[PDB]
């Protein structure tokens, strides 16, 4: 489906009721002059969808309650109303189609539309770009574990590996006890005890002491077997989820990075790949190598790239990651602010080539070269006499190109 509007009420710089309208637009840019409230748009979106990245301070203050509602039209297309409220004591209320629910039931309704808070497959903050462009190989592995679902098996994985380690040395210990017992039997029998008992209750001590060593070993064997099987099952599920995500992203990254580095002067674009850093039978225990080289560049280390080149490589990875679990809509922070005109153009081209049914784009945009190409605009301005932000809309599909 798609979002057709967000409704705000006393949210940050918005006094009273306001609407962030998208309609049937599959590419909306949110724009406005500095200090108009545009930046509060990200806040409202990530608030109503449940992102945790203070709760009393979101309520409008003239210098009392607030809520944000997302209105979503599925493929049927029926309406879904997702409202989060900030009450007078700072706690959150959740409503789905105007009925109260708890936080878990809220996320589940969103998950059913593939709006996945655990993978944040629907939103790119500005900070995500900096974080991606400076992360370690092991950070990237952990990110893929996170978005893939495999990270939820990590602690169970490590607990069961420890059980295997203990139950193993326990088996070896009880095996050596049984080897010593059966060795004491050979010595005790060469003692010719049949004669000693014919001319003794201790012979019954060895009876139950040997019977004990046998039962104890057989229990360590079965316990090690159970631990080994439990561990192998969790290991297989963790590997399965990780490999499925890694395979997708490794396949896509080559294409997305080209799309974002193609130009008239270099129509082939640059080259990127993902790879497991070290040889291993368990890929999720190694770091992931992300290497991207713009056109006509080729050195082993990426830190020699420019800030623009690093940003575009980071965006390509974020797109490739989020394509594994496609969100119906996609919210892009004000990344065009820091980009040169050539890169702003490439972002614009990428969006226009993907924005449509199945992938709605909502973009915070500072650069006209980007937002002048939208299907529609949301302008945010400050009404200073009323001390509130306000919104206007413009349908750009009515006007021509060139």
């Amino acid at each position: 489906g798609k979002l057709i509007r967000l409704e705000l009420f006393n949210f940050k710089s918005y006094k009273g009721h306001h609407t962030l309208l998208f309609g049937d637009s599959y590419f909306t840019s949110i724009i406005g002059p500095n200090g108009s409230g545009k930046s509060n748009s990200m806040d409202a979106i990530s608030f109503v969808l449940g992102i945790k990245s203070n709760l009393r301070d979101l309520i409008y203050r003239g210098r009392k309650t607030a809520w944000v509602m997302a209105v979503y039209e599925d493929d049927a297309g029926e309406l879904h109303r997702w409202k989060r409220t900030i009450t007078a004591n700072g706690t959150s209320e959740y409503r789905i189609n105007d009925r109260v629910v708890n936080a878990q039931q809220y996320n589940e309704a969103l998950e059913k539309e593939n709006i996945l808070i655990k993978a944040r497959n629907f939103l790119v903050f500005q900070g995500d770009v900096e974080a991606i462009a400076s992360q370690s190989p092991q950070d990237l592995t952990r990110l893929i574990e996170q978005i893939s679902g495999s990270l939820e098996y990590k602690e169970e994985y490590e607990r069961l590996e420890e059980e295997v380690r203990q139950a193993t040395e326990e088996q070896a210990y009880k095996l050596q006890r049984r080897r010593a017992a059966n060795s004491e039997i050979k010595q005790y029998m060469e003692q010719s005890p049949g004669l000693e008992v014919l001319f003794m209750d201790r012979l019954d001590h060895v009876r139950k002491q040997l019977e004990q060593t046998e039962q104890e070993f057989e229990a360590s064997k079965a316990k090690l077997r159970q631990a080994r099987e439990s561990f192998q099952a969790v290991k297989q599920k963790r590997l399965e989820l990780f490999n499925k995500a890694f395979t997708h992203i490794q396949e896509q990254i080559t294409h997305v990075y080209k799309e974002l580095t193609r130009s008239e002067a270099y129509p082939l674009g640059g080259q990127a790949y993902l790879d497991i850093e070290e040889d291993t039978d368990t890929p999720f225990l190694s770091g992931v190598k992300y290497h991207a080289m713009p056109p006509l560049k080729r050195f082993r280390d990426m830190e020699h790239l420019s800030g623009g080149e690093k940003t575009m490589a980071a965006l390509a990875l974020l797109f490739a990651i989020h394509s594994y679990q496609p969100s119906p809509f996609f919210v892009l922070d004000e990344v065009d602010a820091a980009l040169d005109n050539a890169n702003v153009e490439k972002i614009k081209k990428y969006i226009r080539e993907h924005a449509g049914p199945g992938m709605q784009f909502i973009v915070i945009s500072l650069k006209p070269a980007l937002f002048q190409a939208s299907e529609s605009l949301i302008g945010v301005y400050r009404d200073q006499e009323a001390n509130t932000s306000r919104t206007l809309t413009l349908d750009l599909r009515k006007y021509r190109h060139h």
């Binding site: 309208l21 724009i31 006007y399």
Partner: protein
């Protein structure tokens, strides 16, 4: 300055009438018929009126979804830009 250009067009239209429609201001600034106005021109003007409103020079009213935008003058319009 882009805002200066828009500030002049609005003071002319709002000196006689109390309100002017955005699409009328856009035809005046584009110096062409509405059928030929381009997305780039519409976005430039749209951003310019948001700037003037944030500065307190004009008032903006839009009561329908993707509806006409009505612009009125403030005192500061004839003292700034």
């Amino acid at each position: 300055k882009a805002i200066v250009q828009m500030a002049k067009i609005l003071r002319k239209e709002l000196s006689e009438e109390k309100e002017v429609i955005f699409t009328d201001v856009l035809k005046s600034q584009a110096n062409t018929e509405p059928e030929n106005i381009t997305k780039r021109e519409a976005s430039r003007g749209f951003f310019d009126i948001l700037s003037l409103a944030t500065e307190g020079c004009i008032g903006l009213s839009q009561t329908e979804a993707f509806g006409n935008i009505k612009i009125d003058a403030k005192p500061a319009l004839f003292e700034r830009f």
